[PDB]
Design a protein around this ligand. Structure first.
Ligand SMILES: Nc1nc2c(ncn2[C@@H]2O[C@H](COP(=O)(O)OP(=O)(O)O)[C@@H](OP(=O)(O)OP(=O)(O)O)[C@H]2O)c(=O)[nH]1
Ligand SMILES: [Mn+2]
Ligand SMILES: [Mn+2]
Length: 321
């Protein structure tokens, strides 16, 4: 019910204050605080994002919510507590982790991502699916980024929320990320209402490229104008900012922004040049991709940009389309 949903949000917003105190003030939180600071998190940024620490006792969140009079079973349903399937006992889901609040589109805390700082597995532990936290709907940072997304008429999608935090701080405000999932149809529906322009900046490795191709193809199919920023090899935005600084980052992002078709064919370049079967198949694919582009202006430019990869004239490619 809406009443239960509200209680679950309250639980999240109240424990956040306790997590923040645990991280910033307590003895047990000291190592986690040092880890964040060495990773560039200022006290200001920690406070701004409301980042905290879940102690390792396994009953810190439990005892708090109990003391405040919350129903323990509801706290379990809210994804803050785990349940022993033997004695039906409850205990903290989040233990010895740095706690990053996950806010919904209206800016309410509806979940957490808990990162290890001692190399434990999994590296990041998220809230489970709950009535208020749904990964197919939530986009990290969307409530903060909405204003800039609208004014800049563009949304930038990154691979993870940590890259979002760093990018935002560096001056790139119109950024979001899913919580480790593939971009959903629901996400795309939300995004369309804000802008028709989406730029993908995933990590500069194979997995990143593959996800760029898969996500981009889907967005293109859905009628969005898709662009791609290609990071240096083995780098994510956080690593780029750490190495080159903020000004270098915001300049880089504004530099080589390529329409999806152009990015795609550049990836396939060698296979096309060497494998005639792939040449034919990818010429048909790229023709189809270009045909999906709603922007008459960008469509004509992509034809010009893609044609040389097949050693054909722009006119020949236009005819194939
Ligand atoms: N041990 C461990 N590592 C994890 C886990 N989740 C993600 N990683 C690794 O860390 C990178 C993704 O995490 P980030 O989002 O960069 O997190 P970070 O900044 O806090 O390190 C990856 O490098 P990558 O090799 O480039 O990933 P991929 O692109 O090759 O798949 C990925 O394999 C986990 O649960 N356990
Ligand atoms: Mn990666
Ligand atoms: Mn990283």
């Amino acid at each position: 019910s809406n009443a239960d949903d509200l209680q679950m949000i309250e639980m999240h917003e109240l424990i956040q204050e306790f997590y923040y105190y645990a991280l910033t003030k307590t003895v047990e939180g000291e190592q986690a605080l040092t880890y964040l600071q060495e990773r560039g998190f200022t006290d200001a940024l920690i406070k701004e994002r409301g980042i905290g620490f879940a102690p390792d006792s396994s009953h810190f969140c439990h005892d708090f919510l109990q003391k405040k009079g919350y129903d323990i079973e509801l706290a379990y349903e809210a994804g803050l507590l785990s349940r022993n399937e033997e004695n039906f006992s409850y205990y903290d889901r989040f233990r010895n982790r740095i706690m990053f609040p996950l806010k919904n589109a209206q800016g309410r805390i509806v979940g957490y991502s808990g990162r290890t700082y001692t190399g434990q597995e999994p590296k990041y532990l998220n809230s489970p699916e709950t009535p208020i936290f749904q990964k197919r709907k939530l986009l990290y940072n969307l409530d903060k980024a909405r204003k800039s997304i609208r004014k800049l008429d563009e949304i930038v999608l990154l691979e993870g929320f940590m890259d979002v935090i760093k990018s935002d701080t560096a001056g790139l405000k119109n950024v979001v990320a899913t919580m480790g999932t593939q971009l959903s149809d629901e996400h795309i529906t939300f995004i369309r209402k804000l802008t028709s322009n989406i730029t993908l900046m995933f990590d500069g490795d194979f997995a990143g490229s593959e996800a760029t191709l898969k996500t981009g193809q889907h967005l293109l199919q859905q009628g969005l104008n898709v662009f791609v920023i290609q990071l240096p090899s083995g780098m994510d935005p956080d690593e780029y900012i750490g190495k080159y600084g903020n000004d270098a980052f915001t300049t880089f992002v504004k530099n080589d922004k390529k329409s999806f078709a152009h990015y795609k064919v550049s990836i396939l370049k060698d296979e096309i040049a060497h494998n005639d079967l792939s040449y034919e198949r990818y010429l048909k694919e790229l023709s189809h991709d270009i045909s999906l582009m709603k922007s008459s202006i960008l469509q004509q430019k992509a034809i010009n940009d893609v044609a040389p990869f097949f050693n054909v004239s722009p006119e020949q490619l236009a005819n194939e389309i």
